[PDB]
């Protein structure tokens, strides 16, 4: 049998959130689900929507409704996106990707996962053409990582051995090299 | 009457040249002229070509000829390009442009000229699409320059007033703002 009901994800909109809160992009997934999918009455949608909000973000929702009583939940979410959503230039998406380097004590397979989230944003905002993202991924790994020289021998084969690797192919080759023998 | 004959441009190939020498890209203009245009005999071409070389660069020319006596001047310049020419990735052209900021005591019209040489290299090497170079120029000037706020008011009109400006249009608007009144 399906286990315990799952708690709502949550969001404050604060300049420094609590470590249990989500990104706006993820709270907006839960909110889009509640709006589009749930078989529920409007005031019960609105009480489930309201129950997820904290911080400053809870405080906007009342102001917007009082000034327009005809507001649907589909319209109220459009006001919520303007105040708490995100604005970022093409140049900022591009510069924020290319500046990313491996940290102290971070593993190479941890770095290559962290770096892949930034490459998707830069391809959405048309900063990088989708035609060349697999070449741009390999060039940035060899630029930013602290590769051991047996790993260096393999990545230099992938650079030359036909087309550039996919994400899961590159991630496999890295994992085979990360393992150490005990003493 | 046309004035005194003009001295040959010159090139050493050294890791630090004398301040009178040119870039390889400019010595190669003079060499391409001598090869393609001058109405001269081969050994006299080769003595004019040789007379322009110094440093290490003078020393290669003999080695290459001894190993292949059939070598034309058109073929000998192809060997010269391999040893002294330039190699640069797409990613290095892009990163070397976007990192460029105004210096201590440099004027804004001096900065916008210095920055335009780097934008041409990045469009040759296909790092930046030629379709968008006029937008990319204005975004980098507002990022890198130390604009006074009356200049800031005008560049923010150009950003919104239809298409982005050309090089000489932007250079005119900057020059009108740089001038000061005496006391």
The 3-class SS string of chain A reads CCCCCCCCCCECCCCCCCCCCCCHHHHHHHHHHHHHCCCCCHHHHHHHHHHHECCCHHHHHHHHHHCCCCCCHHHHHHHHHHHHCCCCCHHHHHHHHHCCCCCCCCCHHHHHHHHHHHHHHHHHCCCCCHHHHHHHHHHHHHHHCCCCHHHHHHHHHHCCCCCCCCHHHHHHHHHHHHCCCCC
Rounded-to-integer distance, Cα A122 and Cα B1, Å = 61
Rounded-to-integer distance, Cα B32 and Cα B23, Å = 14
CB contact under 8 A, A94 and B98: yes
3-state secondary structure of B72: coil
Q: List the single residue in A91, A140, A143 with the smallest CB-CB distance to B139.
A: A91
Rounded-to-integer distance, Cα A130 and Cα A147, Å = 27
User: Which residue in chain B has the smallest CA separation from A97?
Assistant: B95
3-state secondary structure of B45: helix
CB distance A117 to A167 below 8 Å:
no
Give the pair of three-digit tokens for residue B177: 């703002």
Give the pair of three-digit tokens for residue A163: 């087309």
CB distance B138 to B170 below 8 Å:
yes
- Helices (H) then strands (E): counts for chain B: 9, 0
Contacts of B91 in chain A (CB under 8 A): 98, 136, 139-140, 143
Q: For chain A, say whether B139 makes contact (Cβ under 8 Å).
A: yes
Rounded-to-integer distance, Cα A170 and Cα A158, Å = 9
Q: For chain A, say whether B88 makes contact (Cβ under 8 Å).
A: no
B53 strand-pairing partners: B11
Q: For chain B, say whether A89 makes contact (Cβ under 8 Å).
A: yes
User: Which residue in chain B has the smallest CA separation from A143?
Assistant: B91
Q: For chain B, say whether A132 makes contact (Cβ under 8 Å).
A: no
B11 strand-pairing partners: B53
Burial of A39 (0-12, 13-18, 19+ CB in 10 A): exposed
Give the pair of three-digit tokens for residue A153: 């021998």
Contacts of B140 in chain A (CB under 8 A): 91
Rounded-to-integer distance, Cα B22 and Cα A75, Å = 65
Give the pair of three-digit tokens for residue B7: 């001295």
Q: List the single residue in A95, A136, A139 with the smallest CB-CB distance to B98.
A: A95
Three-class SS of chain B: CCCCCCCCCCECCCCCCCCCCCCHHHHHHHHHHHHHCCCCCHHHHHHHHHHHECCCHHHHHHHHHHCCCCCCHHHHHHHHHHHHCCCCCHHHHHHHHHCCCCCCCCCHHHHHHHHHHHHHHHHHCCCCCHHHHHHHHHHHHHHHCCCCHHHHHHHHHHCCCCCCCCHHHHHHHHHHHHCCCCC
Q: List the single residue in B91, B139, B140 with the smallest CB-CB distance to A139.
A: B91
End-to-end CA distance of chain B: 46
CB contact under 8 A, A143 and B94: no
Phi, psi (deg, nearest 5) at residue A53? -80, 140
Q: Give the single-character DSSP code of B182.
A: -
Long-range contacts of A41-48 (CB under 8 A, 24+ apart): A42/A73, A45/A73, A46/A73, A48/A8
Contacts of B143 in chain A (CB under 8 A): 91
User: Which residue in chain B has the smallest CA separation from A91?
Assistant: B139
**Beta carbons within 10 angstroms of residue A32's beta carbon:** 11
Q: For chain B, say whether A98 makes contact (Cβ under 8 Å).
A: yes
**Beta carbons within 10 angstroms of residue B136's beta carbon:** 19
Distance from CA of B125 to the nearest CA of A (A): 15
Distance from CA of A132 to the nearest CA of B (A): 11
Distance from CA of A98 to the nearest CA of B (A): 8
**Beta carbons within 10 angstroms of residue A12's beta carbon:** 19
Burial of A47 (0-12, 13-18, 19+ CB in 10 A): exposed
The residue among B144, B161, B150 whose CA lies nearest residue B108 is: B144
Q: Give the single-character DSSP code of B21.
A: P
Burial of A25 (0-12, 13-18, 19+ CB in 10 A): exposed
Q: For chain B, say whether A91 makes contact (Cβ under 8 Å).
A: yes
Rounded-to-integer distance, Cα B111 and Cα A53, Å = 49
């Amino acid at each position: 049998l399906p286990m315990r009901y799952r708690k709502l994800r949550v969001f404050s909109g604060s300049a420094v959130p609590a470590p249990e809160e989500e990104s706006f992009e993820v709270w907006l997934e839960q909110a889009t689900e509640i709006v589009k999918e749930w078989p529920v009455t409007e005031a019960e949608k609105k009480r489930w929507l309201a129950e997820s909000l904290r911080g400053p973000a809870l405080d906007l929702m009342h102001i917007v409704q009082a000034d327009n009583p005809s507001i649907s939940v589909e319209e109220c979410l459009e006001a919520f996106k303007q105040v708490f959503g995100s604005l970022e230039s093409r140049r900022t998406a591009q510069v924020r990707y290319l500046k990313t380097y491996q940290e102290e004590g971070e593993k190479v397979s941890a770095y290559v996962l962290r770096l892949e989230t930034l490459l998707r944003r830069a391809v959405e905002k048309r900063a990088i053409p989708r035609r060349i993202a697999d070449q741009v991924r390999l060039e940035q790994v060899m630029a930013g990582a602290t590769l051991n020289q047996m790993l260096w021998c393999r990545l230099r084969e992938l650079k030359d051995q036909g087309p550039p690797p996919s994400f899961l192919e590159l991630m496999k080759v890295i994992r085979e090299e990360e393992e150490e023998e005990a003493s």
